[PDB]
Amino acid sequence: SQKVFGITGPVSTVGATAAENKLNDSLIQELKKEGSFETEQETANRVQVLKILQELAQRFVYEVSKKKNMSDGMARDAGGKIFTYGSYRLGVHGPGSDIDTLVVVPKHVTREDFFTVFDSLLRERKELDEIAPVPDAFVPIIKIKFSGISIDLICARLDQPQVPLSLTLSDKNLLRNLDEKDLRALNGTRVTDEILELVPKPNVFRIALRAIKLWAQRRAVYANIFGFPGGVAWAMLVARICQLYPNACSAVILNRFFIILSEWNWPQPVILKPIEDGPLQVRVWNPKIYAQDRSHRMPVITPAYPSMCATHNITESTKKVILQEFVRGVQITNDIFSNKKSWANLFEKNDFFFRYKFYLEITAYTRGSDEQHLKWSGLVESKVRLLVMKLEVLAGIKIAHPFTKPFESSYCCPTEDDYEMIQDKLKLVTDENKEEESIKDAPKAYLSTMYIGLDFNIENKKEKVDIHIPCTEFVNLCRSFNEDYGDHKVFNLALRFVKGYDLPDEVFD
């Protein structure tokens, strides 16, 4: 329409040279080799599950409407519709990707109705492989497996009487009178919906995103919780570049992507359209008004009202890592165009555990249930980011690089002396002896381990600067959160300074 060229108009309208298309085809070839795509069959199986889910959404609404003494024609007209968002919505999902699904219902259909009626309607089916309703998440959701496909299901209820099949959620007004949770549920689809609408060629955009997703995950800079961009972040970033080069191939895009983003005058934010305004008393991203927004280091703003910063977590250290990976990209993709390097080069696994002379090892323990460790450790994990910030600001610390994948492991811990022992360094549970009588019964002890790469300023001081305060603190805050956490009988947290030379063998597996 015009907005497909971004807020600065394109950088160049030039088409792709025959040579550039050759490199683009080889790029897609590599992606295929990496099994990025799925088979026409598996795609067809997702279309089918969704088709059924739509059928169930209508049935859900219809049934609830009837119980409200509605006409046979009105219960039908009340409608009910299914929307997707996430990986599948953008068309960059993979063989094992789940399908994030939003269910929209009229005013008279409540969330309670959702976990009751809709749920029951799901169970009344053969294809239901399993259901894990978690009604109290930040965004109420019902997680299920259907016909061998994972489906995330959240429910949004609009302040209107009907939800027709034609309804699209672009209108800013659909948000009227909604509550925090419903409002939160609409945002996902509204955002992915706009991304696809602000890009010149959605197909060029998809291949380039698959590449960036792969790349980011291999270079260990794809994890929102640790201060790196998440999926939506990476997507908007690719789209901003697709905007700049309307008719280039995905290959030239990845190159311009790395160059521009590494030279970008951060914290100038990246946006796909002019930040809008509106009704709701809700805050919109605005660094002039809100301090919290003035501190975002690399802002990537969502286009759908109300605009938020998808990269809030980024710190000064992860910021450096990200620039570093961008630079390595300028260098490698420039080589791939000179015929001196290949795409596989670009997608090479990182070497986190080989690059620093020291590391901070954080381990969370749990002598209890699988749900207790998932909770405890899930807390520590989320807080690691705070430590990176306390750490990267002290004396002479050049960087505090948080790795992005904790190391999980549990042991059959029968005694008490066995617990207050496995955390001093006892049969390593395994996918082999997991459901075996003797094992499956045995009480367990879990532990999740995380690392922070450290680089001390090689200035010329007599000695490195002790990081005891920040560490002990991080411990405290992590315990001082719940009464159960500050126990010691079930939960434990330890931090050990480790030289690159003494890293655990499991870290290189």
Ligand SMILES: Nc1ncnc2c1ncn2[C@@H]1O[C@H](COP(=O)(O)OP(=O)(O)OP(=O)(O)O)C[C@H]1O
């Ligand atoms: N902390 C969060 N707050 C709000 N929305 C979130 C948060 N974390 C994830 N999301 C939403 O969840 C959506 C689905 O993500 P998820 O299913 O985990 O992966 P995806 O991004 O769809 O990739 P795969 O499904 O892994 O290919 C995408 C995003 O809009």
Ligand SMILES: Nc1ncnc2c1ncn2[C@@H]1O[C@H](CO)C[C@H]1O
């Ligand atoms: N704001 C949000 N909108 C939609 N889904 C969300 C969400 N926050 C979390 N989720 C769900 O949480 C999972 C990813 O963290 C899958 C995704 O559907």
Ligand SMILES: [Mn+2]
């Ligand atoms: Mn998903």
Ligand SMILES: [Mn+2]
């Ligand atoms: Mn999901």
